[PDB]
Amino acid sequence: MDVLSKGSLKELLAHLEKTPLEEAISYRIGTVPYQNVLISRNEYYNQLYPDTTSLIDGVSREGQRNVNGLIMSIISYVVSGSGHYIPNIGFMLLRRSILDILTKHDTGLVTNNLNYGIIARNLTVSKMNCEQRKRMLICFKLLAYKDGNQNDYEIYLNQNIPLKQIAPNFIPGDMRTVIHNQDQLAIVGIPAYRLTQSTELSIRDDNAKSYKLGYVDWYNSNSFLRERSEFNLIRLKDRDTKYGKLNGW
Partner 1 sequence: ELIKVPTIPHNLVLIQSDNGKHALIKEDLGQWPVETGISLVNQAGVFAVQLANKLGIDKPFVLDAGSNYFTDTSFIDTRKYCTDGLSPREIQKALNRQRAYYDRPELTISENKTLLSQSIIYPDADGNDVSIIFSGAMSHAIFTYAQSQWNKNIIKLDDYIREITLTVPKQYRPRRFKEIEHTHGYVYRELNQGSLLPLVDANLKESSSYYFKKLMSSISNVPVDHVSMLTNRLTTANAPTVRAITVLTCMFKQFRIGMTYALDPNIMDVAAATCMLLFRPAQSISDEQYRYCLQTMAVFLTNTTYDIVNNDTIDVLKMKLRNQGWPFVERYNAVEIDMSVEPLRSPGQVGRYYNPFNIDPLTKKHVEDRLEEFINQVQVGRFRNASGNAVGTTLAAFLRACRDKTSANWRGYSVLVSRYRSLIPNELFESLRNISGEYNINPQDEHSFFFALAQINADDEFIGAIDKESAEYLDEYATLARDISNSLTLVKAAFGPLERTSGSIINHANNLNKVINHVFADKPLISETMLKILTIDGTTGKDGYRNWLDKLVGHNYPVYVEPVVNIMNFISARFVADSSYFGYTNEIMIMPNHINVPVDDRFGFRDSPFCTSLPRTIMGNDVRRISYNVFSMMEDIDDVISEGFILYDAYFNFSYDIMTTDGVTRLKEDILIVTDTGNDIKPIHFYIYFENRNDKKLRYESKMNVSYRLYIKTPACLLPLSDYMRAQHDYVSPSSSRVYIKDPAVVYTRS
**Shortest Cβ 215–partner 1 spacing (Å):** 15
Q: Is the four-CA dihedral 148, 152, 154, 157 of positive or negative sign?
A: negative
State yes or no: residue 247 binds partner 1 (CB under 8 A).
Answer: no
State yes or no: residue 239 binds partner 1 (CB under 8 A).
Answer: yes
State yes or no: residue 225 binds partner 1 (CB under 8 A).
Answer: yes
State yes or no: residue 113 binds partner 1 (CB under 8 A).
Answer: no
Of the two residues 196 and 222, which places its CB atom closer to partner 1 in the complex? 222
State yes or no: residue 232 binds partner 1 (CB under 8 A).
Answer: yes
| Other Cβ atoms within 10 Å of 53 Cβ, number | 19
State yes or no: residue 233 binds partner 1 (CB under 8 A).
Answer: yes
State yes or no: residue 242 binds partner 1 (CB under 8 A).
Answer: yes
State yes or no: residue 37 binds partner 1 (CB under 8 A).
Answer: no
Q: Out of 226, 246, 248, 249, name the contact with partner 1 by CB under 8 A.
A: 226
**Shortest Cβ 227–partner 1 spacing (Å):** 9
Of the two residues 105 and 239, which places its CB atom closer to partner 1 in the complex? 239
Q: Out of 36, 126, 182, 228, name the contact with partner 1 by CB under 8 A.
A: 228
State yes or no: residue 229 binds partner 1 (CB under 8 A).
Answer: yes
C-alpha distances in angstroms, 170 versus 7, 141, 175? 15, 9, 9
Any residues with CB less than 8 A from the CB of 4 and at least 6 apart, and which?
A: 81, 186, 187, 188, 211, 215
Q: Which residues within the stretch 195-224 sit at the binding site for partner 1 (CB under 8 A)?
A: 220-224
Interface segment toward partner 1; rule CB under 8 A; list 94-102, 111-119, 126-134, 230-238: 230-238
State yes or no: residue 192 binds partner 1 (CB under 8 A).
Answer: no
State yes or no: residue 126 binds partner 1 (CB under 8 A).
Answer: no
Any residues with CB less than 8 A from the CB of 63 and at least 6 apart, and which?
A: 55, 69, 72, 73, 83, 84, 85, 86
**Binding footprint of partner 1 on the chain (CB under 8 A):** 220-226, 228-234, 236, 239-243
